[PDB]
From a paper:
Clathrin-Mediated Endocytosis (CME) enables cells to dynamically regulate [name] composition of [name] plasma membrane and mediate uptake of transmembrane cargo, such as ligand-[name] receptors. This process is orchestrated by [name] clathrin Adaptor Protein two complex ([name]), which interacts with much of [name] endocytic machinery and functions during [name] earliest stages of CME. [name] is a coat-associated protein that binds to [name] alpha appendage and beta linker regions of [name] to facilitate endocytic accessory protein recruitment to sites of endocytosis. [name] is a ~ 29 kDa, soluble protein composed of three domains: an N-terminal Pleckstrin Homology with ear-like function (NECAPPHear), a central Extended region of conservation (NECAPEx), and a C-terminal domain with low conservation (NECAPTail). Here, we determined [name]-EM structures of [name]-[name] complexes which show that [name] clamps [name] complexes into [name] closed, inactive conformation.
To visualize [name] [name] to an activated, [name] [name] complex, we determined a ~ 3.5 Å [name] of [name] [name] (mu [name]) [name] to full-length [name] in [name] [name] of an anionic polymer (DNA). In contrast to other [name] (mu [name]) complexes incubated with DNA,, [name] was not open, but was in a closed, inactive conformation. Comparing isosurface threshold levels of [name] unsharpened, refined map clearly shows that this density is contiguous and extends from [name] C-terminus of NECAPPHear, suggesting it represents NECAPEx. We believe this [name] may represent a post-open, inactive conformation of [name] [name] complex, corresponding to phospho-[name] simultaneously [name] by [name] and partially engaged with [name] membrane via [name] PIP2 pocket on [name] alpha subunit. We refer to this [name] as ‘clamped’ phosphoAP2-[name]. Importantly, only [name] PIP2 binding site on [name] alpha N-terminus is solvent-exposed in [name] clamped conformation, so [name] structural consequences of membrane engagement are fundamentally different in [name] open (several exposed membrane binding sites) versus [name] closed (a single membrane binding site) conformations.
Author numbering:
A (entry chain B): 5 to 190, 195 to 269, 275 to 549, 554 to 581
B (entry chain N): 7 to 23, 29 to 97, 101 to 138
C (entry chain M): 1 to 21, 26 to 140, 155 to 222, 240 to 254, 261 to 374, 379 to 435
D (entry chain S): 1 to 141
E (entry chain A): 10 to 239, 244 to 512, 517 to 606
The structure:
Amino acid sequence: KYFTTNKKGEIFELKAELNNEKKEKRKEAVKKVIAAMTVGKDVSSLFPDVVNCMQTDNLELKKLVYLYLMNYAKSQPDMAIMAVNSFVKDCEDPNPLIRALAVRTMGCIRVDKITEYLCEPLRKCLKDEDPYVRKTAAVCVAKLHDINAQMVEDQGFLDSLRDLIADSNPMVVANAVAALSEISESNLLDLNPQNINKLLTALNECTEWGQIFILDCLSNYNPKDDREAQSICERVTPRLSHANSAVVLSAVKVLMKFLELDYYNMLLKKLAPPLVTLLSGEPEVQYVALRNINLIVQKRPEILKQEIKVFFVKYNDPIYVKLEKLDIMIRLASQANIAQVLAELKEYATEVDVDFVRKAVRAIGRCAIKVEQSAERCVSTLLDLIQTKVNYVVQEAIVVIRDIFRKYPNKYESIIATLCENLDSLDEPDARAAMIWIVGEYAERIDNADELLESFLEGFHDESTQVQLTLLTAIVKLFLKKPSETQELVQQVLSLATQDSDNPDLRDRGYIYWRLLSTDPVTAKEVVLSEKPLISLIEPTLLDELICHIGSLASVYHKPPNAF
Amino acid sequence: ESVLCVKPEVHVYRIPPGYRASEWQLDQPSWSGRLRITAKGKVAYIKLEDRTSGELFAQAPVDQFPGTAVESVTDSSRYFVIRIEDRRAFIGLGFGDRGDAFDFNVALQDHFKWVKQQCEFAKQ
Amino acid sequence: MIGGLFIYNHKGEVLISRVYRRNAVDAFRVNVIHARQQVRSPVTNIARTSFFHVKRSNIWLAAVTKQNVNAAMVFEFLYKMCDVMAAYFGKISEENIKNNFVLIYELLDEILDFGYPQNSETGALKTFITQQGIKSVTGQIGWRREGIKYRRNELFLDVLESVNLLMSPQGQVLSAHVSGRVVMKSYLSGMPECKFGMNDKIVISIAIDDCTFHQCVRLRSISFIPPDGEFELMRYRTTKDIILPFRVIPLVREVGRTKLKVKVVIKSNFKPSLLAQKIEVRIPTPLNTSGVQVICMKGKAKYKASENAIVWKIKRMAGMKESQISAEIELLPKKWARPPISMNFEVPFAPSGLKVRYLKVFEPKLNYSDHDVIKWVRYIGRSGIYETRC
Amino acid sequence: MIRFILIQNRAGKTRLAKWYMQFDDDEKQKLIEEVHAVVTVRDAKHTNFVEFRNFKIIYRRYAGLYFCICVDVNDNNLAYLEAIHNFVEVLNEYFHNVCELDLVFNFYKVYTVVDEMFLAGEIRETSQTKVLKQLLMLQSL
Amino acid sequence: MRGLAVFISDIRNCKSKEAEIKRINKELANIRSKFKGDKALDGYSKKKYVCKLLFIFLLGHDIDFGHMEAVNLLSSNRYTEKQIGYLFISVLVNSNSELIRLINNAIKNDLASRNPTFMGLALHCIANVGSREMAEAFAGEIPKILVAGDTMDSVKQSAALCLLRLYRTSPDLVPMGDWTSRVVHLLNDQHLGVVTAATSLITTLAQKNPEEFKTSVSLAVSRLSRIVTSLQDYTYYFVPAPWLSVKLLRLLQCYPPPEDPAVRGRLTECLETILNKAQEPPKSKKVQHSNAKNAVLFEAISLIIHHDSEPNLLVRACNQLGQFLQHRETNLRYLALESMCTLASSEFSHEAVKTHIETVINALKTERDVSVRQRAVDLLYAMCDRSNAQQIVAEMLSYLETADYSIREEIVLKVAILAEKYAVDYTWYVDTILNLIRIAGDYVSEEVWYRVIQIVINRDDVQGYAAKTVFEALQAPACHENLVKVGGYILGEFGNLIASSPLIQFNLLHSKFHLCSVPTRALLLSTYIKFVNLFPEVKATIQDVLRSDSQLKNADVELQQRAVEYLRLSTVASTDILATVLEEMPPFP
């Protein structure tokens, strides 16, 4: 072929430097190979020459070959097995970084032929005296399991990992519990006098990552009695103030599980400050922190009942925590602090984020329906937002005041005159569907309702069918309240819904309204104009599943883990 | 006690005196470090602290943001004049980026937006 | 656990990838980086695979995983990966990573080992990592005057955009760039200070990704002082991940040389709460056209003989719907080269994907707030050379 | 016509970039970036006929190098696909088993070969013999 | 020049990008200090300094000097210095009017030269820069270089292409004159290389001047006759001169069929011989032979389609493109599908292309690449008339069940058009659309449902079949959302033609009632009252839905207004009003 040549170019300049005897040029040659792998260059012809640089004693040189062997340990595994006879030489030399380098690299090779070459040098590494080696020999056992090795010999290895839990260096117990958690998907003898007492003495000593895997393992623990469940929670609660976003939610994951219980009222005052100070972190951490508050304030509402001020939305927050601090603000809105929410939700409706103002105005409507003594405040906010005359606010407040007229009939009718002055600014198909209802109902009071629906009727087509059905229902409600003056509309729209329209969902509503009014208008008042019933959370079977998965990604989607 | 905003890279310049920016030294700060804005109820504190250890250098109660405790320099939108309490004393802050002096002004606005607002619900 | 770390650049090219047991590479590229209309959650489950990502200075740090991982721990690891890499590089960038492909391979086998995060304390790594990194007064505001005192404080921030598209008839987006600008009628009193913020859709013949500012703009958050009244704040062009508002399907069936059957289907690629106005579609005809029967059921269309193009003026078109037009063109007998089917429209969103997130306004002396200021936005998108090859 | 000839690495570093249109200094830089955003992706089971921006790309994968000749839509794309391979063999017997670095150390001699075969947007010469009878006469001159 | 290889080895072996720009701008400080410092550079030492400037410009950096020093090199007496000089000023195109006169002073000193390695180098400098300032001085002297017979034949190839660049930049500056009847005469030349640049020139110039070059048709066809019916210099893997017999075959496309019948007698038998070699066994199994023989073919096919002259060839070229659809190379399937789309439109091959309906469908289902796949769909829509419409539409639907997410948008739009345009009767058209909403109903428009329902409402014998078809389509647990609207209406209006039992149909729709949108949930509530009129025994089981607080107390106003009324119609003591108000609806206009 062309452009390979095996004699000059980039490769033969490197094969002259990989075979250079002085190790000053060897290290600079392997670094150029590793940077040539990431771009995508064929360096597979360099492979039996890089491995000749392993016969060395310089530490910086062997780590550079191992990165060349690491990228080929996973991408092209049938080549990395060519170097296995120098791996097991490096599982016996001193400078026990190299002990931990060879065991890490042989764990990544997904060939079944390493198992007679790895099962023996794991057993010297799991009893090594420098505990950096046991930190990666314990994770290699979880790497040996993912290699297709059922391996009752590795069931002789799990006898060593359970011994590694009762070790002296807690960076070993960081991985030994992390491996025994992940290999438990295929175990974890949770002995009450010995294992749990040694896990918790590890917990106050580990890294800020091993205190995640231990608490993610105690989330699979079940107490014997409720006397034990107190003496476990008195040692997890010191892990509610650590400088990591992760440790706290794993220490909430244990406490929200171990409330199968006086102390039950004591613990809720200790679970509330760190779940509040979980939001002083970076923006992606809050999105996990807020969607685990969003389960806790559904499951146990009495924890964060008094802390709504922290959940207010700042201007510079990203949109995934502006839409989520808004949602938790709704679930904590009560009779006492609705004065602080509605004066805050009015503040977000004068912003510029269109899809956030469109949800901040609706959150006023989810406060009026939720908190029933506050609808006068929720209406007086909405009639002030329409005085700002902003056409993405008025076209959203007119949909919410429809949902306040339905929940609360014949108390707030007097602001319909304040609404309909902004009739010309209605453009959205949802906002116009709300006005035609508001003229449709209460047409016994709006005197010129016979003309307001007719101005919508000239452009009856080229509209959404949400409007076209609602205008069909509103003129018929206008007919059955005033069967003397708007009869000339009912010949119009009902020969626009049936004779002209091609949508059968619009058309069948036309003939059903047409055959009512030509049969019996006394019955038709009982059908169309009957008094409508009033209008109005994770389902608790699914909710009690997710509190077992507080810190994890199952709670972030509010989905059970079988959908992953 | 809450934390309104907290930022590194502020600079304290001594004040030869109004309060124009160029009448200072402007070349080498007499102090540098991290800014902390704390809130003990109604009394807002600015906290000048070291960026490594957390050693509190100087601290000033505000209580009035258009008041004389925080006075923006008439020249520029980033340099300030603060009344430190120990004893009343005038040292001059000065911030690096405009966004670090905008988010200072907003954080001392929104706290006194809240203090006046709770004075309204107290009357209700 | 951590199925792997995918350090992506601005363009979507994989700078550094590690895998711990790829379709996961480009499932993140298409559906997170070049996501068109979606609101950006930081973690998203796309086709049974979870995609964590943390952006640090135009670098996508994807942490692609499958199982039920502790999502607080991943996001707390993707920060701890930066604070190691910041101690070795300074700023995270596309230029510092490409200088240090070797060092990051020694970090991503030290700070994590088979997905599990390890002891990533930067004081401890210096004994285990041998590679070293490769490092690299406004006296008077001269564009507004003193004492502007208006009776009501307002900002009319309308984002004006023009869309240019040449699309292959197979639906392949060949050329697409939006040349748009941000105009704000500023009726703010005093001497205010705005902090205009927006999303990450803007990079700060052939169209080049570009963005220029006004002289008042100062430079992720634009901070300025607005001149009195209307001023062109920010003019930009952008050629990536364009939200195309309409898809035109040129189904043309030529029958010999005496007829021509032209069917053009518009599909509207935006949500139905929005509504596009003044739609005009120009469907060009051959030069020897002798008479055209246009039958379209929605909108008006007529054969303009002096232009040799069937102009199909439909007044309003909502989102997600579609229309058809048929035209059995008669011919009068070289083969006819096909000029593109051009389209003219206006849409009430910004098709470059630009959305305004926040705009605070502070005045120091004669105090008013943001919530005293009635702030409008008005996203106006528009066609320019909006062609579809016939 | 041929609008540009582009020999580029898989990394993206260009080797030959011969332009036959008037493009600006940044417009030349972006079109190069858009080619290997396309040519580096697709493998040997795809066609060599990319419908690029307004006009075709005809490429061939050569062992780490991509030879992209960028062509109007109405030209014979299978003829210019062999005009690539006719151009590679001329670089082969002139550089004597040409490697990748012979386009870097001898970049000015590549500009002679491409001006010998592809002049003014169009195939000047087709013969491998009459190039190398002419091109080896230039080398002793 | 070994001073360059020391430089480039220092640039490429930099540790970083910033270590390059420290070494680049160190070398530019050296080159500027030699030129502006002006110690006399003895020829070739200036040649490596300009060549280092040219390498620095090709790395992306900026060069703002040395243009005056390269114009020194154009007056040199060696080819090696004129090569770097005529390359630095054609790559770094400047706008200095001080220099363009100094360049054009140097090009005229080389065009006056009789050396073909200097004239052959000067015409490269003109045809690469190509500016109007060079076009205005050289529009009259390049044609006299191209015509005059004492010019070496390796310069006529360059001047004919330099006049091609000078015509494409400044077409109102090279006029047709006494220059025209000698460029046509170049097609009798001894080289096939002069002819390659000549038919390049006559192809573009006859786009706007077709009649002035009409004498080239009898010269192109007689020149193509000796190529095809045969050139050891120009054979490219046993194919005689491929790029000549492509460019000589694209010259013929700029024209009508030839007026002289001795040339049509010569052009068609030379188009037969290109078409005859495509069925012959390959002289070489190399893939670079299978393109160069087919590159001449896909212009020989594209010539016949352009003429539409003789039906014998359009039949044979179509039967030639039948073999390339079943081809192991992805190019020859993609180019056969682009040719047959332009072939199926003309009236002489439209009957002949319909015999390849079975091959394209097998090429539709097999192909991995979507770009070759979308050309098959564009061919099937172009092949379709009434004599094969039910064959394609049934096979586009049976493809669509396993189709990928890419092409599924394009097929649904074409099946709905081919069903409506080519409906044999209404019983077929309901049958396919019902299936189109079953298979890929997410992409079926709401303009398409309405003609399904309005044919089921209007006609009589598609009422029982469409009642069966939507009931068998709704029993899949993941049916598409739009058939729930279509099936929820048709089972509402025509449910008593498949009663399987009424208790199944309500429990089927109510299973589909949730997890759906607002108008789907709206339209199903209009169904639940139509069952009360038609099916008197399911009445007790429907009102237990219509009295629930997930219906009467629902948040959006249309579901509440529809569920309250359709509760009251069957609850208010009234049977004669319900059978009246829900009578079978009249047909549509």
